[PDB]
Amino acid sequence: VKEFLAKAKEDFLKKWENPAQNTAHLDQFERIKTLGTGSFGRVMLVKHMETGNHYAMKILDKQKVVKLKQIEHTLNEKRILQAVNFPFLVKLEFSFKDNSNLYMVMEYVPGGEMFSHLRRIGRFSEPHARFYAAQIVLTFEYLHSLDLIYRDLKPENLLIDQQGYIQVTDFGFAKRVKGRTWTLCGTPEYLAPEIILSKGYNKAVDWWALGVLIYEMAAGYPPFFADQPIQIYEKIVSGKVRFPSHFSSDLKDLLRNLLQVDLTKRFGNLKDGVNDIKNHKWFATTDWIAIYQRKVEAPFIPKFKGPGDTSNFDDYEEEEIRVSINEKCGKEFSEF
Amino acid sequence: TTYADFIASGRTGRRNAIHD
Numbered sequence: 001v002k003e004f005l006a007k008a009k010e011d012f013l014k015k016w017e018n019p020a021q022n023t024a025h026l027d028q029f030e031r032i033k034t035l036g037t038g039s040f041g042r043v044m045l046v047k048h049m050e051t052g053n054h055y056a057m058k059i060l061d062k063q064k065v066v067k068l069k070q071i072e073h074t075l076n077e078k079r080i081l082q083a084v085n086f087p088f089l090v091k092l093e094f095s096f097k098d099n100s101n102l103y104m105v106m107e108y109v110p111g112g113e114m115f116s117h118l119r120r121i122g123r124f125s126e127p128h129a130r131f132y133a134a135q136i137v138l139t140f141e142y143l144h145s146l147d148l149i150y151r152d153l154k155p156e157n158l159l160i161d162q163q164g165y166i167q168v169t170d171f172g173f174a175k176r177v178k179g180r181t182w183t184l185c186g187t188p189e190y191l192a193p194e195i196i197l198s199k200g201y202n203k204a205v206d207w208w209a210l211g212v213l214i215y216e217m218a219a220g221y222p223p224f225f226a227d228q229p230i231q232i233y234e235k236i237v238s239g240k241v242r243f244p245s246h247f248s249s250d251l252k253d254l255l256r257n258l259l260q261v262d263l264t265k266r267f268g269n270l271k272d273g274v275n276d277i278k279n280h281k282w283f284a285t286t287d288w289i290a291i292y293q294r295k296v297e298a299p300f301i302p303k304f305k306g307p308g309d310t311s312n313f314d315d316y317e318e319e320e321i322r323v324s325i326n327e328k329c330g331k332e333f334s335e336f
Numbered sequence: 337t338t339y340a341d342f343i344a345s346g347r348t349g350r351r352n353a354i355h356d
C-alpha cells in the first residue's frame with residue numbers, strides 16, 4: 001500500500017503539474033445518444049471514428065457553468081481526472097473545448113448505474129454490498145493519498161462495468177486540498193453533519209458518505225430521507241440512525257462508527273484512518289489485494305447486448321449541440 | 337414499513353446535487 005501509493009502519488013503530481021489539453025475535437029466523434037443530463041451539461045454516448053471506439057462524452061455549457069458559479073469546480077474536475085489513475089475511476093481519454101462548450105470524453109461503461117439495479121433489485125445482500133464498499137474504500141485511499149476529496153459518493157455516480165466492478169463517475173466536486181475546505185456541495189441524503197453545519201470540513205466527509213452508501217445498498221433505502229432537504233438535514237445532524245432487522249451485528253457496528261456525527265470519533269478520520277475501516281469485522285472476509293486486482297468473483301454481471309448498447313440507461317430528450325460563432329468565456333476557462 | 341414509506345416518498349428517483 002504505502003509502496004503503491006508512493007508511485008501513484010508521483011505519476012499524479014506529474015500530470016497535475018502539467019495537465020494535457022486540446023487532445024481532440026468534436027468532429028472526431030459521432031454524437032449518438034444522451035445518457036444523462038443536468039444543471040449545466042449532459043453526457044452523450046459517442047463514437048470515435050478513427051478507432052471506432054465508444055465513449056461517454058460530457059458536454060459543459062460554458063455560460064451555464066458561469067451562472068452557476070462552478071468555474072473553479074469544473075477546472076478542478078478536468079485537471080484532476082487527466083491526472084488520476086485507478087481501476088475504479090472512469091478514465092478521461094480526451095478533453096477539449098470550442099466556442100460554447102467544454103468536453104470530457106471518457107470510457108463508456110455500458111453496465112449502467114448502481115442506482116438502477118439497486119432500485120430495481122430493491123437491496124443487495126450484505127456480501128454483494130461489501131464487494132462494492134471495498135472498492136469505494138480502496139479508491140478513497142487512493143484519492144485521499146493524493147490529497148483529493150471526492151465529495152459526491154452515491155449510487156447515481158457508480159457504474160458497473162463488464163467484469164462487474166465499480167467505476168466512479170462525476171468529479172464535479174473533486175478538489176485537491178490539504179487542510180479545511182468550506183464549499184457546501186454534494187447530494188442531500190449523503191451530506192455530512194459538518195457540511196450541513198457549515199463548519200469547515202475535510203476528507204472525513206467521504207467516509208461518512210460511504211456509511212450512507214453501504215446502508216442504502218444493504219437496506220434498499222437511505223438512513224435519512226424525507227420529501228424535503230431540510231427535513232433530511234434534521235435527521236442527519238440528529239445523531240440517530242435505525243437499522244433493518246436483517247442487518248448483521250458487524251454491519252451495524254461498522255456503520256455506527258461510519259455515521260459518527262462527531263468527526264473526532266468517526267472511522268476513517270482517526271489515527272489509523274482507513275485501517276480502522278479495512279480491519280473491521282464486517283470486512284474480515286475481504287481480500288483487498290484480490291479486490292484491487294479484480295480477481296474476486298463478482299456478485300453480478302450486467303447484461304450488455306454489445307458495444308454502443310444503451311439499454312441499461314434510461315432515455316432522455318435529445319437536443320442539437322450548438323457552437324456559437326463567438327468565443328463565450330475565454331479567460332474563465334483558459335487553462336481547460 | 338420504512339421500505340414502503342421510501343417507495344411512497346418523492347425521493348426514490350435520481351437525486352440532484354446541491355451547492356447554491
Ligand SMILES: Cc1n[nH]c2ccc(-c3cncc(OC[C@@H](N)Cc4c[nH]c5ccccc45)c3)cc12
Pocket residue numbers: 035036037038039040041042043055056058059060090106107108109110159169170171172
Ligand atoms: C455512462 C457513462 N459512461 N462513462 C461515464 C463517465 C462519466 C459519466 C457521468 C459524469 N458525471 C455526471 C453524470 O450524470 C449525471 C448528470 N449530472 C450529468 C452531467 C452533465 N454535465 C455535468 C457536469 C458536472 C457534473 C455532472 C454533469 C455522468 C457517465 C458515464
